Amino acid sequence: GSSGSSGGEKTFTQRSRLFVGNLPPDITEEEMRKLFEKYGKAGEVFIHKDKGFGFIRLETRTLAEIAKVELDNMPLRGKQLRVRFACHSASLTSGPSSG
């Protein structure tokens, strides 16, 4: 269970961490968990008022993607919701040709 106080054995990373901004003053850990009930319970859920932000971390990646676009630009109690990859910041090093 809770082993490795200092560190432990190599574990998975948190690349699937979605950042939620512009959160309403009526948002709680509950609302969040329910908001992402379609993509399963987020591994990590933290909501800060003083700053007005919420960090969510899903298990898989496919979910974060579907929810990243779906939730992205979604109305919440009248307020707006900004969803942007916390770990990934417009970092696309490639050039796929198409047309």
Task: Count CB neighbours of 87 within 10 A.
Answer: 14
Contacts of 56 (CB under 8 A, 6+ apart): 17, 18, 19, 20, 32, 36, 42, 44, 45
Domains of the chain are 1-99 (3.30.70.330)
**Distance of alpha carbon 46 from alpha carbon 55, whole angstroms:** 5
* Of 77, 80, 88, 83, residue with least CA distance to 56: 83
Which amino acid is it at 56?
I
Answer whether 15's CB lies under 8 Å from 61's CB.
Answer: yes
CA dihedral 32, 33, 36, 37 (to 10 degrees): -150
